Design a protein around this ligand. Structure first.
Ligand SMILES: CC(C)(COP(=O)(O)OP(=O)(O)OC[C@H]1O[C@@H](n2cnc3c(N)ncnc32)[C@H](O)[C@@H]1OP(=O)(O)O)[C@@H](O)C(=O)NCCC(=O)NCCSC(=O)CCC(=O)O
Ligand SMILES: CC(C)(COP(=O)(O)OP(=O)(O)OC[C@H]1O[C@@H](n2cnc3c(N)ncnc32)[C@H](O)[C@@H]1OP(=O)(O)O)[C@@H](O)C(=O)NCCC(=O)NCCSC(=O)CCC(=O)O
Ligand SMILES: CC(C)(COP(=O)(O)OP(=O)(O)OC[C@H]1O[C@@H](n2cnc3c(N)ncnc32)[C@H](O)[C@@H]1OP(=O)(O)O)[C@@H](O)C(=O)NCCC(=O)NCCSC(=O)CCC(=O)O
Ligand SMILES: CC(C)(COP(=O)(O)OP(=O)(O)OC[C@H]1O[C@@H](n2cnc3c(N)ncnc32)[C@H](O)[C@@H]1OP(=O)(O)O)[C@@H](O)C(=O)NCCC(=O)NCCSC(=O)CCC(=O)O
Lengths: 210, 210, 210, 210
């Protein structure tokens, strides 16, 4: 939208561009989803949104994304940044926070189209939102969590320098799933960062966050 | 979106086109809002949204339109149709229903940019959604409410054949306001209809309501 | 509770005492419900709560009553008054309002165990809360609604001087039901009232309502 | 209530009795609250309910307890057990769980009136619910969280054998507060349980949880 400055935000790395999904990018993301996100014998997500039928996925996705855009509040926000490789939407690296002005703590969530995995994009797009969070938002801590049987996202966290932060368990599609929690302080983030990241279009967004 | 068939719906009258607001149409509706919606000595809405600052109005509108788009369910839907006069979205004629397949009853809500009022677009645009509800959705009853000090929406209802359906009162900006309720039966709609209305691109949407 | 002054409110008529339901009264109420509330061929309630099994009904009722007691706010309250005959709970005459300090409008809901119907308790217990509403809370309007096939509550309303205030239709257990709405102004109440009503224990409650 | 079997549950230790709060016990808890729960320099609670005026405390507390009583569901429950010392309610040892049939994981919350602190009641009351969770409910994990500056609950956790399970930070009365997370497996519970515990009246409640 041309009426919400958050649409002008750009986070760029040597291979990726991240930005809030426009109407065009949402449709691209649905196209990517329909080509496949994960092997059907896995469930990497808290909410099993990828189980939805081919017919339902498109609107479920539009709905979720619309709701996330619409729910932005200074004290409770979620930013699902579309990840682009040469202008094409390959996945989402979200960043969110509750009471950010007070806590200075963000968490994240991610997915990539299946054919786009295993090329370092997941590490890079994480490095990208962390740069945004620490350098632009002046976050102090970033957290993430991964199911024990989701080693790609565990490795991404370990690569970006997160430390172990305890264990959780949740109901995952009717069965107990163990989860690992990760924590990244600004110190740790600095000591492990290797991706050159640039942010543009943020000046006008500053007062929305604080 | 090209992934939601409701975007293909068009309801046209001799002077108007109504459709679901796309990214661009939402921003056009916002441009119109920022030129003025109603006399400030007046509050024709139960939610005083037009009172928000020039700074807040654009996101508040997006948020709301997005929530409605995201919210479509067979048993609880709201269609916020953009009303186009030239190549500009001048207002919104909404149609909504809870448990529609059972009750077959719809209600409506409306607004037009200040510079567009008084040209008979209010009556024409109500006639358009009413034709859509009765003739395409197969509704049996349509309802509406107006504050007693909003004679233009009262006159639109009367011109379209609606009958008194009782009195209400609500809190409007911390003061009591009286409302008039209106009810249009399918048979009363036939009796009083004068506007030629055409519906296109609904065939693929049909299952969504049924 | 001895910690909430609304438990001291007493509304008394020649045959009835109405009061907020204590632990004991809630239990009497459930006893009464388990003996039966209406012929199974009928559904007089918006929410089909009497359809629940005999196993589930006791907790459904406690949960419901607990929630209404817990939910009291100045701008949003519901008073599920237990109706006592011979000192034992025979039913509930509820009074409720949203934005009462501004609208000064209340509505009501009621039910009696089967063996307690047709004695005029329903009329008398309506009279009881109408008096409390107008004389004690200074309401200006009371409303009520009945399914068209629920003549006993319709007749209680007509008897207390309410006037027809429109038609509605809802889903009721998977089928369409017509509802009649009723409206009583202060003056109409004062023209039709015949029951002697006394209110005790309200002085300390008064500030909770305005 | 005599219509909800959970009211028949008794968890007894050599000094304490825990049970769901009846109307009487809720009033005793409030009495205890009005005498004070913690040093006002401190905020041990994520929700600062002890900050309410003495005027609002009683209804806030009834409202909270009624909501927890009323909100019981197989997949989302909270048991706010009254803690009785010499037959009077002196605090609450809550036990709660979301999706328990699948996760087999519980969490807990506690408070005692000032004058009852420092006599081993907190340690013993935790053991009480832990034995109930592990021995009766067939839990596999129990969790707990304490703010860093809340050494009494930390100590209770350590004494009951919980292990460190990470860090969190939250907004606490407008300021950032660090919290510590504790985890206790069935095995570590077994290794460390000293307190003798009897559970009665659970026999009929069991199906409600499974
Ligand atoms: C999780 C991601 C985004 C990760 O992206 P990529 O596949 O691009 O990762 P990458 O940058 O190529 O690096 C992946 C790292 O995982 C390793 N790796 C991959 N699969 C492995 C396996 N089966 N066993 C062991 N290691 C494995 C690679 O060697 C590399 O480690 P080295 O650097 O050591 O060589 C993706 O795979 C995906 O979208 N998967 C499906 C959905 C999903 O799982 N979403 C995550 C939910 S959990 C979540 O949302 C929290 C995460 C967050 O905060 O964003
Ligand atoms: C309500 C509308 C959409 C009405 O449309 P217009 O202003 O285009 O009116 P119109 O089509 O030109 O004419 C319709 C009837 O209104 C009469 N009319 C117009 N302006 C009037 C006025 N100021 N005083 C008295 N009557 C007036 C015309 O003579 C005509 O009557 P004849 O046919 O006898 O010649 C608009 O006024 C508006 O947007 N106002 C600000 C927002 C608002 O009020 N929204 C509605 C809130 S209440 C609501 O949402 C429920 C309505 C619904 O269900 O859609
Ligand atoms: C509705 C009530 C509370 C009504 O109480 P009573 O039975 O004590 O009523 P009453 O004072 O004895 O007077 C009942 C009136 O019903 C008439 N009546 C009874 N059955 C009738 C029938 N089948 N056909 C025609 N008339 C009938 C009687 O002649 C009398 O009218 P005359 O004066 O002309 O002789 C109760 O019947 C009940 O609990 N019913 C089942 C649950 C229910 O329907 N709840 C109401 C939901 S609707 C609602 O909640 C809104 C009402 C409210 O605001 O509280
Ligand atoms: C937390 C409790 C229930 C703790 O119960 P008690 O007071 O009976 O404690 P206890 O069993 O007698 O053991 C207390 C032990 O705490 C330590 N201790 C107590 N106060 C301390 C202080 N100021 N500094 C350092 N240590 C301290 C000592 O080791 C002491 O053992 P010695 O006697 O050998 O010296 C209570 O203090 C309380 O209600 N406090 C106010 C509200 C509160 O903080 N609630 C908990 C919120 S956190 C939560 O709810 C999660 C915990 C849960 O799962 O229930």
């Amino acid at each position: 939208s041309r009426h919400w400055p958050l649409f002008d935000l750009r986070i760029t790395t040597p291979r990726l561009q991240l930005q809030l999904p426009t109407e065009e990018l949402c449709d691209q993301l649905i196209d990517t989803i329909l080509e496949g996100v994960h092997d059907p014998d896995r469930m990497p997500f808290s909410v099993p949104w990828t189980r939805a039928s081919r017919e339902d996925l498109p609107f479920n996705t539009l709905s979720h994304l619309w709701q996330q855009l619409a729910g932005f509040k200074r004290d409770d926000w979620s930013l699902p940044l579309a990840v682009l490789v040469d202008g094409r939407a390959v996945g989402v690296q979200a960043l969110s926070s509750k009471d950010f002005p007070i806590t200075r703590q963000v968490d994240s969530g991610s997915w990539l189209g299946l054919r786009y995995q295993g090329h370092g994009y997941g590490t890079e797009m994480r490095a990208a939102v962390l740069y945004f969070a620490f350098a632009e938002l002046e976050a102090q801590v970033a957290t993430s969590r991964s199911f024990v049987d989701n080693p790609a996202s565990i490795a991404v966290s370990r690569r970006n320098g997160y430390r172990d932060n305890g264990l959780d368990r949740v109901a995952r599609e009717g069965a107990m799933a163990e989860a690992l929690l990760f924590r990244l302080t600004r110190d740790d983030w600095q000591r492990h960062r290797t991706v050159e990241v640039r942010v543009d279009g943020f000046d006008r967004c500053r007062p929305l966050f604080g």
